[PDB]
Swiss-Prot record:
Boundaries of every Bromo domain copy: 3-104
Subcellular location: Nucleus, Nucleolus
Subunit structure: Component of the NoRC-1 ISWI chromatin remodeling complex at least composed of SMARCA1 and BAZ2A/TIP5, which regulates the spacing of histone octamers on the DNA template to facilitate access to DNA. Within the NoRC-1 ISWI chromatin remodeling complex interacts with SMARCA1; the interaction is direct. Component of the NoRC-5 ISWI chromatin remodeling complex (also called the NoRC nucleolar-remodeling complex), at least composed of SMARCA5/SNF2H and BAZ2A/TIP5, which regulates the spacing of histone octamers on the DNA template to facilitate access to DNA.
Function: Regulatory subunit of the ATP-dependent NoRC-1 and NoRC-5 ISWI chromatin remodeling complexes, which form ordered nucleosome arrays on chromatin and facilitate access to DNA during DNA-templated processes such as DNA replication, transcription, and repair. Both complexes regulate the spacing of nucleosomes along the chromatin and have the ability to slide mononucleosomes to the center of a DNA template. Directly stimulates the ATPase activity of SMARCA5 in the NoRC-5 ISWI chromatin remodeling complex.
Family, per entry: Belongs to the WAL family.
Reported tissue expression: Expressed at moderate levels in most tissues analyzed, including heart, brain, placenta, lung, skeletal muscle, kidney and pancreas.
Entry domain remark: The bromo domain and the PHD-type zinc finger recognize and bind histone H4 acetylated on 'Lys-16' (H4K16ac). These 2 domains play a central role in the recruitment of chromatin silencing proteins such as DNMT1, DNMT3B and HDAC1.
Posttranslational mods: Deacetylation by SIRT1 in late S phase enhances pRNA-binding, allowing de novo DNA methylation and heterochromatin formation. Acetylation is high during S phase and declines to background levels in late S phase when the silent copies of rRNA genes are replicated.
Protein name: Bromodomain adjacent to zinc finger domain protein 2A
Organism: Homo sapiens (Human)
């Protein structure tokens, strides 16, 4: 399971999930709601997947955790227009994540 040295990542993820702009990213992009997503996005990522991976020990290092966070935001900018509701949310969340990360790095 998660090593205690990564508790700071667990907290960052909790804070991200609580953010007002996090709603698009809480769970995997849902084919019931969105068509053609995995046709374009070859490595989907979302905060629930990250939360489970972190807790089970699937991130050995904070860098691996951060790479999945950035993948959420990179996928969002690949698929969504910048002025769409989800596109705007991705930009908010990237800034929020980078600000929390920069306290440590
Ligand atoms: C906040 C916002 O601006 C939204 C936009 C542009 N679209 C949707 C949307 C599309 S489908 C959908 N849901 C509603 C709940 N049950 C299943 C289908 N909601 C939202 C709702 C945000 C949510 F609360 F769900 F996180
Ligand atoms: C294509 C994409 O990247 C998306 C991500 C990462 N999230 C959502 C989304 C929309 S509604 C939604 N949830 C929020 C939680 N309650 C249930 C409904 N999630 C989309 C689809 C955006 C749409 F095409 F619908 F405008």
């Amino acid at each position: 399971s998660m090593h205690s040295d990564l508790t700071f990542c667990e907290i960052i993820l909790m804070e991200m999930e609580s953010h007002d702009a996090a709603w698009p990213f809480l769970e995997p992009v849902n084919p019931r709601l969105v068509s053609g997503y995995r046709r374009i996005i070859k490595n989907p990522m979302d905060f629930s997947t990250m939360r489970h991976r972190l807790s089970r020990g699937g991130y050995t290092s904070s860098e691996e955790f951060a790479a999945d966070a950035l993948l959420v935001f990179d996928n969002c900018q690949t698929f969504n227009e910048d002025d769409s509701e989800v596109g705007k949310a991705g930009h908010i969340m990237r800034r929020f994540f980078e600000s929390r990360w920069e306290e440590f790095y």
